[PDB]
Amino acid sequence: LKWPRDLRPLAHHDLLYMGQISEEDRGDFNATLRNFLVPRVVGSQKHREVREFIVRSLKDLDWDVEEDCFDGQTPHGIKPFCNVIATLNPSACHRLVLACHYDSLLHKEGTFIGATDSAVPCAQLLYLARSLNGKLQNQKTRGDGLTLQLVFFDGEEAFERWSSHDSLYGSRHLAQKWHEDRTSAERLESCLERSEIANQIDRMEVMVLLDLLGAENPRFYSYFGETQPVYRRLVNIESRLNDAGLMELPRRRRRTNYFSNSSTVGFIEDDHIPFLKRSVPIVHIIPSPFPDVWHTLDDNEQNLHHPTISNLNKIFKAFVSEYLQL
Numbered sequence: 001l002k003w004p005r006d007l008r009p010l011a012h013h014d015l016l017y018m019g020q021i022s023e024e025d026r027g028d029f030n031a032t033l034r035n036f037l038v039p040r041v042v043g044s045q046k047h048r049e050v051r052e053f054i055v056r057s058l059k060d061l062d063w064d065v066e067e068d069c070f071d072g073q074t075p076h077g078i079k080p081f082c083n084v085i086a087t088l089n090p091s092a093c094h095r096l097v098l099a100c101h102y103d104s105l106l107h108k109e110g111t112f113i114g115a116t117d118s119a120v121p122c123a124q125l126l127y128l129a130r131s132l133n134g135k136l137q138n139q140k141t142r143g144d145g146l147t148l149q150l151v152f153f154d155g156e157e158a159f160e161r162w163s164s165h166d167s168l169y170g171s172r173h174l175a176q177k178w179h180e181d182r183t184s185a186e187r188l189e190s191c192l193e194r195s196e197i198a199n200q201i202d203r204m205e206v207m208v209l210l211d212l213l214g215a216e217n218p219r220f221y222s223y224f225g226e227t228q229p230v231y232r233r234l235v236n237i238e239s240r241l242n243d244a245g246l247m248e249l250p251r252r253r254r255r256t257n258y259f260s261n262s263s264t265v266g267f268i269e270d271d272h273i274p275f276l277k278r279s280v281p282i283v284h285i286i287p288s289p290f291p292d293v294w295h296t297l298d299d300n301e302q303n304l305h306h307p308t309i310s311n312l313n314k315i316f317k318a319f320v321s322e323y324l325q326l
């Protein structure tokens with residue numbers, strides 16, 4: 001079966017613009033990122049401050065911002081959790097959903113910043129919203145039934161040993177709630193013709209989940225045959241940015257190959273799982289192998305690789321622009 005939305009390839013002009021990264025772009029991304037480079041364990045004041053920063057940043061861009069807040073039992077007792085859901089045009093039937101988690105692991109050995117996991121993805125989602133604001137507010141007025149939605153899940157990390165019951169608190173809770181929230185085509189703006197919408201989960205056209213990003217030379221693969229058409233757009237975008245000489249490399253005449261033109265047989269538990277079980281198509285942007293720094297106290301600011309982060313920003317900006325035809 002083909003992808004339900006015809007994926008029009010990005011004009012060269014637009015590929016070039018989305019692939020430019022000014023010095024002001026860098027500075028703005030880095031300033032955003034600084035806000036996330038703090039321990040933000042569930043229940044903590046800093047966690048509250050990060051949640052508030054996300055909320056304010058996006059209300060400032062005129063997005064609709066809601067919070068799914070609840071208390072859940074954990075191996076450490078009751079804990080408050082709040083998912084943050086920002087939607088550019090609430091009434092648009094279909095959402096391109098970009099996501100990541102904003103809580104950081106409670107590490108037994110000491111203070112854990114979780115720079116790749118996932119302070120970087122958090123900043124990249126806000127950066128996308130801000131760098132593309134003009135283009136996005138224009139897309140919003142088209143009435144074409146498609147919009148952008150940003151989900152920052154809470155409580156992705158286990159408190160103790162990873163289990164089905166100790167992990168994904170926020171995503172399990174939000175998938176469930178959206179599944180039970182019934183709606184229909186007639187209630188929504190411009191659903192595609194062959195649509196089946198019974199609940200809010202059906203409006204998630206594809207969920208692109210960013211995780212563990214920011215270390216040098218990540219390797220991605222297609223994890224889901226269902227989203228191979230979308231994943232291939234990432235492969236192609238990166239390839240065009242390389243052709244254009246828009247990627248920051250150590251030496252002349254290298255190319256990035258982040259997005260492998262293959263699929264791998266790998267099972268990664270992450271915030272996608274509760275949506276995957278409800279038939280949401282998933283593109284899982286997570287490196288394999290994981291960064292060397294994963295769940296160590298070295299997952300910190302100085303171990304981020306800035307040229308890679310800028311290269312990923314180019315890819316993601318050109319991808320959002322291509323998907324939404326910005």
Ligand code: NI
Pocket residue numbers: 105117157295
């Ligand atoms: Ni983690």
